[PDB]
Amino acid sequence: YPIINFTTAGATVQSYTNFIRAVRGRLTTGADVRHEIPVLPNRVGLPINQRFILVELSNHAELSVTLALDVTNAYVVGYRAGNSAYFFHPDNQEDAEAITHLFTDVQNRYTFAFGGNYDRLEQLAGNLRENIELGNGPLEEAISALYYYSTGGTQLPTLARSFIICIQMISEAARFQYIEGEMRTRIRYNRRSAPDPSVITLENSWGRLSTAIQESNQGAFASPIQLQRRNGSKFSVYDVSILIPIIALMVYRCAPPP
Questions:
Q1: What positions does the record give for glycosylation?
Q2: Cβ–Cβ contacts within 10 Å for residue 256, how many?
């Protein structure tokens, strides 16, 4: 499986930008593009030898962890840290079988009893996304927390908070140029802030947007989708045009019309 590398150690807007770019390149094949927006590979009929990509994360503290993402949705399904690998609770027989193809030589394999969805993680973390800071520092720390989990160094709430940091700074950033942009800003000015309403709203609407777009009539949505700006004010989306600068990847929802 392909491996993309990134380190928080001396991270710059450029290093992070090159990183996210390489991830998108490994997530999509460039076969499916609609209205100038790349669509992730359809899960139906996808060979297992092309199912995942690995994201190796390192930090100034010289520690490393490797995240395993599913190319069909960019979701983080588990990670490896030294002699141990942990997987979120599979959601169906297919996914449970699939993950057995990852980190095949790790001494110890574990499968969490909870899922990797935000609702669950926030609950375990004891904080919502709107109250969990993002930036190079939080990522630096997250990497450390994931690494010391198997040795009893990381408490569950802190591990959950860590996943939430990694998922938004890697997967969400890959999905949205907008979100990638906010992270770049954080890195440039070395600031540590929780995600604003525009970020949360986008994170929550990825699937809907992907469908609205793909099911659109020449790019015109049947029904508008409500998003939020940074000051939390409402603003409707009726067309894919205004999303081109915003969404970088879509989950496959349907076949494109002729």
A1: 5, 231
A2: 11
